[PDB]
């Protein structure tokens, strides 16, 4: 288990959610996709990411 700096993306693989993890102390080159089941101990960063997605969805809505 490693310290997480930020959550950068979200996707589904075979219908199951994953998130893109920037690891603290590692460069972005080593970012990895992880099952949402793996990130229970960084939900503040996951919430930050979710908040940003919603903000962008609201923008896409506005422009439509």
């Amino acid at each position: 288990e490693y310290v997480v700096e930020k959550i950068l993306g979200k996707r589904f693989v075979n219908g199951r959610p994953q998130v893109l993890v920037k690891w603290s102390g590692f460069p972005n080159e080593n970012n990895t996709w992880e099952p949402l089941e793996n990130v229970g101990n960084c939900m503040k960063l996951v919430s930050d990411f979710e908040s940003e997605v919603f903000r962008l969805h609201r923008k896409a809505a506005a422009k439509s």
Binding site: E1, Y2, V3, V4, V21, W23, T32, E34, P35, N38, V39, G40, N41, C42, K44, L45
Partner: peptide, 7 residues
Amino acid sequence: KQTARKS
């Protein structure tokens, strides 16, 4: 601390 398991 914010941590996660690495797969």
